[PDB]
Design a protein around this ligand. Structure first.
Ligand SMILES: *[C@@H]1O[C@H](CO)[C@@H](O[C@H]2O[C@H](CO)[C@@H](O)[C@H](O)[C@H]2NC(C)=O)[C@H](O)[C@H]1NC(C)=O
Length: 686
């Protein structure tokens, strides 16, 4: 029985409850319905909805955490948006600002004074407080050696804070009367009084809501400037790159189940009809106006423009940002039982063949290099960015998605020899993608359709990702298994048209179209064989021909063969001569890469540099183990790797790839988006 439900919204107070029923009537005259409740607290409202006792409730980031925590583990279904300038606002950046001419960054701040707005409030407490806890700054493991209050003393020497139930070394530079000071109500805080701290010099370090140094006084600028977590420091409007946190913007949670989208539809509709534009008696976002503190941001935040949707996958750990998460993880959510301080490197293993590979190391790395194995190679991307994982060595495409998520290359591979590594003379390496056409052949990029094709596998950059990539920009939709009359592409569907060329099994079980050892048309040469025996074209490397031609591949087929029988097929028709890989290649394909996070970079390279020669190719302990080798199969690290040098500092995946590469990789996956790739992406436009 098809879609048609009732959405029971969760409340907090009676006045907000009353406005709830006041929509009833419409929910009624409309398809999806409602049933409003009321809970004295939001924790109750959360445990309520959780136990299917209710549908959903819109929350803040400070709560959205708690809401996402177990056993609740509630999902963020849709955020709220606002009117500023930058873009289509969906957050509120958490920064920090001090006076110009500062002789420190943060690694030595274990003594200077400070200044907050109040305790347990974001930007002020929580955030910098948590960021510092997780950045080890404040030697702290649990309140019983240094409470959130205690620890302050053995970190600070001054803090202007309204929290005085226990500690004093966090109650100093607050201006005013001798009995009205450390009170949350003292005008020496909020966003201006604490901003008055650096202004009236009463406190050295002070971090508040961003862009307040604009609301306050656009004029006098550089007397104050923002300070980054990565050594750097910058000007007034330099927050979108030098802000402590990606402080979110009120979202809408819910459990994780079938009864979900209806929650999206009973609202989006409760918007398009009865929204800010509604010509009725309701303003679903609260018209910008003042009111009674009892009735503020009711049902939904009053200072909102509209509500934007949030991806299926999207969790707390993700929606609110890493920063905020890392910050608040430093708290009493757990001191260090399910979240230790293992500063040392670890790796996203992807396979039992890989985990243990990583494990094969973990003994001979005495902690210097840890492990966490995975199932889908895409688990890597989320884990690292989740802080759970540290690094990863992946293929071309995965690098794209990653970079969109915020992760980037830090130390790429080398496929020639270390005898061209530790230097900055000729950085990248030449491996090209070519459209191998036959000598007397018919084919060409202009009559390439309806041709029998030969791909290595359903996924290798040169042997697949690129063809389909270029192809996309002239395919209608990604009906790749609906272009060539047929072909072989080991890994494509069972009885598909794309496996038709696959000569499958060598004998025994009819393993056709397998990206397995058991395949005959597997790999570059396999797919080349394909061109020779069946196909009208084969997608492979620049020097894939040379490898066999010249009397090199001494097989039942190649024996004779001269590349004087193969030709390059250029995207413009030009039947280029094999030897011109440069002037007739499909794509200049990059080498793999260790994509990681913007905060552990230069030092992660180090870790790999330490172990580099320790367990590297020309390495010393070659009698113990290595790194690239693994049963003689590419495990995380391809086996055809010698150097793995520290790349260029301050680059980007877009740069790492190349326009002619990014361009097509970006616009290929456009043709068919995906979860991870979708979540990271909507977060790009925050
Ligand atoms: C195929 O890729 C893109 C996407 O279809 C085509 O055009 C875009 O290419 C890049 C984005 O992927 C951008 O740099 C271009 O500016 C963009 N085009 C426009 C009008 O903005 C591109 O033409 C195709 N590739 C080639 C080589 O033609």
């Amino acid at each position: 029985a098809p879609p048609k439900s009732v959405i029971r919204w969760c409340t907090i107070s009676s006045p907000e409850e009353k406005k709830c029923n006041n929509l009833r009537d419409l929910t009624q005259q409309e398809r999806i319905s409602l049933t409003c409740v009321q809970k004295a607290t939001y924790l109750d409202c959360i445990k309520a909805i959780a136990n299917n006792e209710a549908d959903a409730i819109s929350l803040d980031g400070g709560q959205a955490f708690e809401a996402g925590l177990a056993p609740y583990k509630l999902k963020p279904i849709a955020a709220e948006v606002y009117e500023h300038t930058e873009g289509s606002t969906t957050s509120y950046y958490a920064v920090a600002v001090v006076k110009k001419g500062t002789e420190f960054t943060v690694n030595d701040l274990q003594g200077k004074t400070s200044c907050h707005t109040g305790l347990g409030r974001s930007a002020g407490w929580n955030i910098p407080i948590g960021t510092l806890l997780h950045r080890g700054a404040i030697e702290w493991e649990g309140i019983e050696s240094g409470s959130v209050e205690q620890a302050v003393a053995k970190f600070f020497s001054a803090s202007c804070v309204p929290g005085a139930t226990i500690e004093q070394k966090l109650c100093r530079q607050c201006k005013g009367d001798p009995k009205t000071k450390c009170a949350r109500n003292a005008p020496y805080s909020g966003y201006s009084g604490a901003f008055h701290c650096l202004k009236d010099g009463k406190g050295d370090v002070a971090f508040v809501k961003h862009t307040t140094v604009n609301e306050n006084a656009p004029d006098q600028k550089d007397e104050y400037e923002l300070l980054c977590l990565d050594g750097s420091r910058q000007p007034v409007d330099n927050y979108k790159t030098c802000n402590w946190a990606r402080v979110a913007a009120h979202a809408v949670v819910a459990r994780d189940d079938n009864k979900v989208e209806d929650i999206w539809s009973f609202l989006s509709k409760a918007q398009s009809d009865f929204g800010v534009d509604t010509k009725s008696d309701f303003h679903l976002f609260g018209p910008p106006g003042k009111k009674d503190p009892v009735l503020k941001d009711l049902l939904f935040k009053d200072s909102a423009i509209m509500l934007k949707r949030v991806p299926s996958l999207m969790d707390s750990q993700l929606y609110l940002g890493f920063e905020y998460y890392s910050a608040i993880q430093s708290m009493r959510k757990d001191q260090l039982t399910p979240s230790p301080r293992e500063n040392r490197i670890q790796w996203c293993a992807v396979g039992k063949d890989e985990k243990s590979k990583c494990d094969r190391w973990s003994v001979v790395s005495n902690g210097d290099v840890e492990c966490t194995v995975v199932d889908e190679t895409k688990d890597c991307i989320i884990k690292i960015m989740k802080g759970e994982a540290d690094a990863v060595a992946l293929d071309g495409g995965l690098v794209y998605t990653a970079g969109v998520c915020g992760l980037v290359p830090v130390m790429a591979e080398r496929y020639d020899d270390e005898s061209q590594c530790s230097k900055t003379d000729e950085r990248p390496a030449s491996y090209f993608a070519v459209a191998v056409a036959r000598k007397d052949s018919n084919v060409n990029w202009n009559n390439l359709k309806g041709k029998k094709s030969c791909h290595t596998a359903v996924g290798r950059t040169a042997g697949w990702v690129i063809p389909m990539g270029l192809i996309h920009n002239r395919t209608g939709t990604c009906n790749f298994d609906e272009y060539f009359s047929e072909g072989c592409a080991p890994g494509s569907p069972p009885n598909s048209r794309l496996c038709q060329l696959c000569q499958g099994s060598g004998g025994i079980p009819p393993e056709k179209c397998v990206a397995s050892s058991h395949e005959k048309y597997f790999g570059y040469t396999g797919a080349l064989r394909c061109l020779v025996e069946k196909g009208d074209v084969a997608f492979i490397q620049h020097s894939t021909v040379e490898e066999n031609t010249g009397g090199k591949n001494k097989a039942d087929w190649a024996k004779n063969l001269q590349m004087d029988d193969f030709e390059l097929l250029c995207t413009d028709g030009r039947r280029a001569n094999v030897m011109d890989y440069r002037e007739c290649n499909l794509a200049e394909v990059p080498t793999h890469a260790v994509v990681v996070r913007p905060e552990k970079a230069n030092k992660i390279r180090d870790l790999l540099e330490r172990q580099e020669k320790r367990f590297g190719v020309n390495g010393s302990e070659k009698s113990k183990f290595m790194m690239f080798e693994s049963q003689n199969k590419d495990l995380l690290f391809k086996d055809l790797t010698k150097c793995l040098f520290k790349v260029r500092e301050g680059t980007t995946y877009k740069e790492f790839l190349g326009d002619k590469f990014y361009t097509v990789i970006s616009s290929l996956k456009t043709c068919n988006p995906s979860d991870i790739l979708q979540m990271c992406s909507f977060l790009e436009g925050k």
